[model samples]
Target chain A: KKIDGRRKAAVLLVALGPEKAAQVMKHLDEETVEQLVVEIANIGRVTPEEKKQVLEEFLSLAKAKEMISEGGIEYAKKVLEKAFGPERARKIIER
Target chain B: MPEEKELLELLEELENIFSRSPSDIAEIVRLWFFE
Candidate 1:
């Protein structure tokens, strides 16, 4: 099954492991942290496919910062090409 | 692929836990997944 926000939160926490999750959790608001923690606790097991999907999504949000730091779509297209191939870069930029 | 009924089922779980409407859950989830 595809994940929603809560499930995605769970997936991210699982991917990050305890140490990394603790560091990032400190930045969020109290309620946000509470809610996410409950979701994480309730999430019994996360499949690899869903885990990959959420990780990609979180990375895209980070990549979006590059788009903002650079210009918009056009600027992002070229910036993304430095690390990833043209086709992959285009996919990330398009997202 | 997800059906409308299946989507509603997912939303229902959130609505019960979060005490929010299905539409609200849907919107929040969209923002979460998409953004």
Candidate 2:
């Protein structure tokens, strides 16, 4: 479920977008902020399609957790199974 | 196929963003670094 540093940076940048992403930068130490800005800049033009894919993936995960938090894990699992299919949904909730 | 499932799991992590209290923000950001 984990991605490497560069891919994760791309995901965070694309997910947060420009203005909000900048807010996150201010939290880190000077060096990390400087390094991440450079890394993100070099991440190139995150293709629109790829950004959308990451967004959608994030949406689904958030939905699954919402379902889990309110209805209990088993109930949430069923919801995810219905929405995403049993095998795939199993992979999702296991996280 | 594996990537497909991992993608779904990654989506779940997105929930961490919703709790944006100042403490949670720092927590989330710290968590963000895979710490």
Candidate 3:
């Protein structure tokens, strides 16, 4: 799937690491980053097809670490709970 | 539940969940024990 500017930016930030992620995030508009955060966070739990699309977008934009940073992992897990409900999130994250 | 059964169940659940996603496994553990 084609990654929009915001997602591309996110992939870049993730590649950069936490300090870099923070610096780049500061440069980005808050709204854009927030949207990117929401999507990045949701990617792991998405359907396999959707996950593949997101993965492709991620790979096109950044390396494995960049495509999904440790920080992004945490953020996505949080959003998974929000998107899937707490109990479901617990089930997904606990393991 | 018997202690062993509970332990086994927890281990099985952990395996299942870890396979499904690894993003917040740490957080889930923190919640399970602390919250």
Candidate 4:
């Protein structure tokens, strides 16, 4: 099953911690902020592995999208495969 | 019942009640989650 996207966002925010999260949240609207706030409360505790994975995915997706635009999809895929391994590269592509 | 869950709803209502700066909102909510 697909994980909740909101939950992932909450995880990212938690990884950011309060100050940075608040700084980032400064850019968001109340509607978005409200849901994230609720999710953060519900999120309770986060594992180090979970935090690492979420942050890694966030960075990988950002880079992958940039590469996809800079190079072609095939070029981006090959580079991503080299950097993140085959399965992770394919998953990033899927994302 | 989880009071924190209900706390969010009240905070949501507060948002509708009056104007709040985005920074104010972020700071308060940040406190809720991280403090």
Tell me the spans in candidate 3 whose CA falls farther than 4 Å from its real position. Answer: A1-6, A45-95, B1-35
- Real A-B contacts recovered, model 2: 0.07
TM-score, every prediction: 0.52, 0.48, 0.28, 0.48
Docking class of 3: incorrect
TM-score of chain B of each: 0.44, 0.38, 0.57, 0.43
User: Residue A89 in model 1: shift from native, Å?
Assistant: 15
Candidate 1, backbone clash total:
0
For candidate 3, write residues A1-95 as lDDT tens digits.
54454444344334334653454445445675576566556534333333334333433332324344368777687569648977788787675
Poorly placed runs, candidate 4 (over 4 Å): A65-95, B1-35
Of candidates 4 and 1, the better by TM-score: 1
Per-residue CA lDDT of model 4 for A1-95, tens digit only, reads 23356666787667555866776786777776787888989998776556555544554443332334354677677578658988887677685
lDDT of 1 at A72: 68
Better of 1 and 3 by TM-score: 1
Q: By descending DockQ, how would the candidates be arranged?
A: 2, 1, 4, 3
Estimate candidate 3's RMSD in Å.
Answer: 17.5
The per-residue C-alpha lDDT of model 3 at residue A80 equals 92
| lDDT computed for candidate 1 | 0.57
- Where does candidate 4 clash, by residue pair? none
Which digits, one per residue and each the tens of the lDDT, describe model 1 over residues A1-95?
Answer: 66667788677656656765665566565777787778778899777567656655654543342335545676466467646968887677474
**Residue A81 accuracy (lDDT) in model 1:** 67
